[PDB]
């Protein structure tokens, strides 16, 4: 179960629905997550044909794995815009090659 294994990469799901990634989503996400530690990179990818509570995936690569662990514990189950956010980890090497649709 990839999502359960701590890494520098945090995956946020259910932030917004399919086709709903507005112009402010990335900055709203990034600037909140910097409170857990320095964020190195943010990728938003929408999985074609996926369900609405799963299509939009937001990846944050932290500089420290310690910051990433803080993020997951705080962000999992947290509200964002009326939705319950799912937060977990993602494999670093898959993230670095943009293999972004793996089951977590």
């Amino acid at each position: 179960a990839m999502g359960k294994c701590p890494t520098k990469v945090v995956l946020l799901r259910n932030m917004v629905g399919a086709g709903e990634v507005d112009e402010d989503l990335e900055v709203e996400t990034k600037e909140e997550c910097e409170k857990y530690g320095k964020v190195g990179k943010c990728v938003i990818f929408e999985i074609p044909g996926a369900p609405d509570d799963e299509a939009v995936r937001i990846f944050l690569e932290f500089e420290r794995v310690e910051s990433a662990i803080k993020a997951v514990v705080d962000l999992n189950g947290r509200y964002f815009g009326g939705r319950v956010v799912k937060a977990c980890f993602y494999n670093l090497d898959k993230f670095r090659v943009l293999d972004l649709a793996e089951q977590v």
């Binding site: 709203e28 909140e32 947290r78 509200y79 964002f80 815009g81 009326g82």
Partner: peptide
């Protein structure tokens, strides 16, 4: 600095 969507309930 409109308030973020963080912690917004339904």
């Amino acid at each position: 600095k409109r308030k973020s969507r963080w912690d917004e309930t339904p």
